[PDB]
Amino acid sequence: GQVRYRNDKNGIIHTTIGKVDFDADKLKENLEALLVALKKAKPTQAKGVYIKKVSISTTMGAGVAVD
RNA sequence: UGAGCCUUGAUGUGUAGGAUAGGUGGGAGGCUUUGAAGUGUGGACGCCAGUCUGCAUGGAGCCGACCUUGAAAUACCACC
């Protein structure tokens, strides 16, 4: 559907993607969609590396990032 | 004995509140015989009210959005 969020003052944001029933392909497409979304807003004031760690977790799962 | 690093924990009050509300969103139920509340103790922290925990009984109960609260569960889960 639609999702919108505002990053934390500490430079980190958490986002709801959907129900974990979705498969890995859905997770990956949503991840890349939001990645491009935030890379559009990537401003000049943001120097150097931008995507540090997108720690995806769940109600009973650990938080891990991707490339 | 410093400087950090990774990991594990404890640490977080104007007060609108059942209250020592750190951003998060985890989504409405988790934790619990891998043992509950409720009781007799070691506590340090202590915004002297409250957090946590080993020991002994209990070992089946507390916490829900609950009732609010500008900011809600602090059921868990991770991140910071």
Q: SS3 letters for A3-25?
A: CCCCCCCCCCCCCCCCCCCCCHH
Resolution (A): 3.5
Cα(A54)–Cα(A66) distance, integer angstroms: 6
How far apart CA A3 and CA A6 sit, in angstroms, is: 11
What three-state secondary structure class fits A51? coil
Between CA A20 and CA A62 the distance in angstroms is: 14
Q: Contact, A41 vs A51, CB < 8 A?
A: no
Joined together, the tokens standing for residue A52 give 């540090």
List, as own/partner pairs, every contact residues A5-10 make where C-beta atoms lie below 8 angstroms and the sequence separation is at least 24, other chains included: none
Q: Which of residues 31-60 of A touch strand B (CB under 7 A)?
A: 53, 55, 57-60
